[PDB]
Symmetry: C2
């Protein structure tokens, strides 16, 4: 089954803990959001992995350059996975991946904004096994909806051999769009954190995923 990931897009640890204290055990992966990485720094990764060592922790650092340096910082803070932004030089993804292997972790390419199919082939040739297909929140706010072009692109990435994560303002009702595709992870940030009942929101996601896959 597709795993469920909660995005902790919080500015401070105490704000993040307001969410984790409700739903840490209701999800498979705990993401330190980019907002939290910039707010608190990599202590957020160290702290959350110490709290939830049995969970996969993702540092959503969106690394753009200095792949080995920034990756090592996250992995030394005990991240399982790190993100590299899609426009990074290929050597940045390669550098992050080399460090990830030292820690038995993994690298995901975050597909936020502009990227190309040639770049996608480079990631595959470099040994990258995970991509995050992301509808940007700012695109969403400008009226961009999930659509058939997304489903097509997601299928194409899956066929290239990537494990695909899907994210970007996902609501419970969006899940059936992706049916039949071997999605690795669905991320929910707002739709879990900001729900009247975060526990219900997480359980509904898990229920629906179980129903559909």
């Amino acid at each position: 089954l597709p795993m469920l990931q909660v995005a902790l897009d919080n500015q401070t640890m105490d704000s993040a803990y307001e969410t984790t204290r409700l739903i840490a055990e209701e999800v498979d992966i705990i993401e330190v959001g980019t907002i939290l990485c910039v707010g608190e720094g990599v202590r957020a990764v160290r702290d959350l992995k110490a709290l939830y060592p049995h969970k996969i922790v993702l540092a959503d650092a969106k690394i753009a350059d200095a792949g080995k340096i920034l990756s090592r910082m996250c992995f030394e803070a005990n991240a399982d996975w790190v993100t590299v932004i899609c426009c990074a030089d290929i050597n940045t993804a390669k550098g992050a991946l080399d460090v990830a292997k030292e820690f038995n972790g993994d690298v995901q390419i975050q597909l936020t904004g502009y990227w190309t199919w040639e770049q996608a082939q480079q990631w595959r040739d470099a040994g990258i096994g995970q991509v995050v297909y992301h509808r940007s929140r700012d695109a969403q706010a400008a009226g961009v909806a999930w659509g058939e072009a997304d489903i097509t692109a997601i299928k194409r990435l899956s066929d290239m051999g990537f494990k695909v994560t899907v994210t970007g303002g996902l609501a419970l009702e969006d899940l059936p769009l992706f049916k039949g595709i071997p999605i690795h992870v669905f991320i929910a940030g707002r739709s879990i954190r900001d729900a009247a009942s975060p526990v219900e929101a997480a359980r509904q996601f898990k229920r629906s995923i179980a129903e559909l896959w």
Copy 2:
């Protein structure tokens, strides 16, 4: 005008950054909180460095990729003057960051790290972005990528489009003459200042060379 000099504080902790700034804060024009320091310490790095050096321009090199308004606002509430947005970001990300920047009488630079297109550049101009950072990736550098002709051509084209262009990426003193004759807004030096035997003298050498080349 002479190109200004910006120090990149790509340190993992505040105390390491201060080992540099206590030497060169008054020897450079712009103090950058490097992406490595934003990730190492969080946005308190911006707040603390601006409190130390409130007369200096402080750049938060956050390389914002999405959530332009939220991430911009965090940096500006920490008293940043400038923030970076990564070149692949949705155009509405750049716009959102710029909207917030205007509230704080700050500014946004697009960081040209990695892959981007001339269509995207026209979009940034049309959105009201007035600065770009032309960057040779350190990982590209380590893979043997040198500065050269194609860079000069693109930097000129960016300047002609109306951007103030910052040049950065493993710059050494010996690289500066490649850019002579171009109205460069800022040169950034991270490693070549921080890691010098004498950071003060490294900064001063950059300043002397710049004054010779653009004087």
